[PDB]
Design a protein around this nucleic acid. Sequence first.
RNA 1: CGCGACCUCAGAUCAGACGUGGCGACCCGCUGAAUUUAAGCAUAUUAGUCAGCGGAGGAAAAGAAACUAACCAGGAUUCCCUCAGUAACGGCGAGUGAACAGGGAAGAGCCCAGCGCCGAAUCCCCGCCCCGCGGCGGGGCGCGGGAAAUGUGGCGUACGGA
RNA 2: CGCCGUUCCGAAGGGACGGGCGAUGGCCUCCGUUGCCCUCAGCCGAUCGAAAGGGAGUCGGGUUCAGAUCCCCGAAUCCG
Lengths: 202, 27, 86, 50, 118, 122, 53
Amino acid sequence: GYKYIQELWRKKQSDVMRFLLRVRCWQYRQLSALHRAPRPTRPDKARRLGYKAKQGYVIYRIRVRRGGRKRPVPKGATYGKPVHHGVNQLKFARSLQSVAEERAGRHCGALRVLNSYWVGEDSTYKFFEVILIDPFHKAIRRNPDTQWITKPVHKHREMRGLTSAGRKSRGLGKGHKFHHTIGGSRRAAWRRRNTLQLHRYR
Amino acid sequence: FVFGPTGMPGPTPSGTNVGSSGRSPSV
Amino acid sequence: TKGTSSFGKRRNKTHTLCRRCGSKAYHLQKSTCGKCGYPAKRKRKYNWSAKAKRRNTTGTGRMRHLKIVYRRFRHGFREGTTPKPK
Amino acid sequence: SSHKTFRIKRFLAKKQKQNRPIPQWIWMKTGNKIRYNSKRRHWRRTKLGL
Amino acid sequence: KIRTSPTFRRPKTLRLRRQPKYPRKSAPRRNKLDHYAIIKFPLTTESAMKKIEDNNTLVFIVDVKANKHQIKQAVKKLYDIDVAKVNTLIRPDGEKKAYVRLAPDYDALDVANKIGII
Amino acid sequence: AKIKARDLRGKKKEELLKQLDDLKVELSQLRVAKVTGGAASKLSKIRVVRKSIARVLTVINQTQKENLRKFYKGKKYKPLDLRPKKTRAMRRRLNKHEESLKTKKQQRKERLYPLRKYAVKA
Amino acid sequence: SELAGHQTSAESWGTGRAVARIPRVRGGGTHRSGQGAFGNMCRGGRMFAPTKT
RNA sequence: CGCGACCUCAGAUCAGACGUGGCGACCCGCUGAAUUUAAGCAUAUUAGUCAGCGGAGGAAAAGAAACUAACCAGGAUUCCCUCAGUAACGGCGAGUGAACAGGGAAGAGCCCAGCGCCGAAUCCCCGCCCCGCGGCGGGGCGCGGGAAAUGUGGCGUACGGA
RNA sequence: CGCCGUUCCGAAGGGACGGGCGAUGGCCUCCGUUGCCCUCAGCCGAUCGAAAGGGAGUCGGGUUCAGAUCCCCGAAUCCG
Ligand SMILES: [Mg+2]
Ligand SMILES: [Mg+2]
Ligand SMILES: [Mg+2]
Ligand SMILES: [Mg+2]
Ligand SMILES: [Mg+2]
Ligand SMILES: [Mg+2]
Ligand SMILES: [Mg+2]
Ligand SMILES: [Mg+2]
Ligand SMILES: [Mg+2]
Ligand SMILES: [Mg+2]
Ligand SMILES: [Mg+2]
Ligand SMILES: [Mg+2]
Ligand SMILES: [Mg+2]
Ligand SMILES: [Mg+2]
Ligand SMILES: [Mg+2]
Ligand SMILES: [Mg+2]
Ligand SMILES: [Mg+2]
Ligand SMILES: [Mg+2]
Ligand SMILES: [Mg+2]
Ligand SMILES: [Mg+2]
Ligand SMILES: [Mg+2]
Ligand SMILES: [Mg+2]
Ligand SMILES: [Mg+2]
Ligand SMILES: [Mg+2]
Ligand SMILES: [Mg+2]
Ligand SMILES: [Mg+2]
Ligand SMILES: [Zn+2]
């Protein structure tokens, strides 16, 4: 059609896309940290991630500060064995995109997070856009293609790590690389491996 | 018509005081 | 002087009855309760006191609406009906 | 003090009305064990918290 | 229309009034502080019988949430007696005693004679 | 006279509020008899009149509520008191029609490939 | 039970005090105050090797 | 100057909804020790455990392979026996430590975007008509209002499909 | 979870006189009402913080077993 905007948004090192990503990043850097967008900045990436252009679908733009997770402790002094004297070079286990989806999914707690995507970044900020669905509209309630999002099991998909950006952080998957999450999750594997089955007859 | 007696409560005292004033220094 | 003498100066109270939990732990200066953190929306409770929870849980009080929800449950929360009249 | 508040005058009033003995006709009941009132309070010994 | 002041102040827009499509609660809650609930019973103590006899007053144990206005207008309904003034005080028991002083012509001793306390 | 709730349902709103405004005066005169000192025959009538007032106000609120939910019988929005009150999660479900809704793709699968009933020989 | 005998908070008083060095219940103006808390020997307390399921 | 669009953005006690807090045995996402073991101790161990924070459901999570294999090949997830105290990790010290295959409990698959095709063929809202009416719907009207071409609905999804 | 922050990255005033338009109730005379524009408006930060700071206005005499600048009598006074 969308397949032109798609292959265009892959030459981010080009001239046109390095001008656009820069005027976009400048304009985003002037607004609030979490503000509602009028329409999806990337309409193609939004369709690909499940955004039907109909009432009820909401797009929030949100910026997050880049960099690792300095340990929250007093001056230095993380009292423990030298193993855990690390404060500076530590990293967070959830992607900045998963932190964007839950800073939107918490600021606006009525809406259900579907997905999110990258719309720009600079040295000190990363800008994402979160596809929030209003689960009590009738364009979503009645349409049976998307009435799964309205059941109480999917409350705060991103606080429970069920979105795409979240699921990418739990190391789950099929293969010889993802053995430590056989079962539900890493802790449901850990439980069964660290659980002593004591039969009646031994 | 049998009348009744009475009853009054009071906090239970606990013995933990130790003056430890006595000193026997002999190096 | 740190003892019996300076036990007389105690005349102005630190805490008063909290309005959310009725316990005498509302720090008048810090303006927050030490028992439930009243000005905060979330009731404060920590796992490191297994016993302080059992003093404030859904059974400890009247359950004036739960003891009826547990009764309306045995019939799927029927509504707008009455038994057949005499 | 004498500069009470309403919430406190009312709590003291409740603590005044809880401070009376069991009616004598109440341990001639059938399923009875209460010999006397044990939750009583004296203003001198026990100091009502607060 | 020139900008005379260098401060862009927010323009005042229009504000409608609530035209609901359905009242939230179905019926207005009845006034539970009735003229009858506002006066529980009188006192028959020689501290109040000297008020009735000498001061030409009456002593009621009114509800605690009652004003001197509600009391005045609730003795002028249950007993049909114009009232000079009302002086309330909350007892250590918890109830609100109220000394109601009757108009000059009305006789307390003879309006307590009626209602029973005498 | 034993005031039963049955013979209170035919009477009119003001033929009920006159009974209420008479029972409250009978209370006031009994709470006075209690403090002036009266016969137990009177003292024991307090529990009888407090419950007669309870019966009256009960029939008043019941007839008024029935009239209300008749007035809003067929309307779309009705007061949150007349709306069916079940558990919050039970009120925030999908209708039986939204549950019973199917996409045209599944109304076509269910039609072209129904679940056949069969047996096998042993 | 697995919690029986351990639902209290009690630390030994230590040497001195002319007391038998068993843990003891903390403070309080009650009978059960500095009274011996854990161990099979004490009243209340936990039994030796609590039977398991 | 004014007028009329559109975009972006405010204001409402605007009409109608929604969230918040509690419980927490089980479950999901992060954060995360030190007692102790090593006859000391610093890596390791305790342990991704206790504490801490957030979010749910009657189950949750996972789930129809960017899989296992190297066979004469198997075929979503979860669970049990077994593999196995194994391969491997480790001051190769203390100690730690899976998976595949196989036998079982259960057993079920699917759906979009995209690429094209169709006169937007789609959806929400208010007013009136008749019913249904205590899980707010069915059918009819409205030169009634909107959403939507910056893409709604039907066919269709890797097992190929038109 | 929340913390920081208190005029700081803010479209932060829902108010007033007069006028014009519109409606309303009555000596519908003449005021009052509320709807719409026109004109005008600084502020300086929501709110809390003192029974000893600031803070208009009550004194005499009588009386109870326990209350009086509080009740009774008699003299005033402030605010609206
Ligand atoms: Mg971690
Ligand atoms: Mg990756
Ligand atoms: Mg202090
Ligand atoms: Mg909590
Ligand atoms: Mg004392
Ligand atoms: Mg389809
Ligand atoms: Mg025991
Ligand atoms: Mg509204
Ligand atoms: Mg060691
Ligand atoms: Mg050792
Ligand atoms: Mg050591
Ligand atoms: Mg270590
Ligand atoms: Mg924990
Ligand atoms: Mg919650
Ligand atoms: Mg539930
Ligand atoms: Mg699930
Ligand atoms: Mg397998
Ligand atoms: Mg073996
Ligand atoms: Mg390990
Ligand atoms: Mg296998
Ligand atoms: Mg089988
Ligand atoms: Mg399409
Ligand atoms: Mg596939
Ligand atoms: Mg103040
Ligand atoms: Mg002052
Ligand atoms: Mg002063
Ligand atoms: Zn509290």
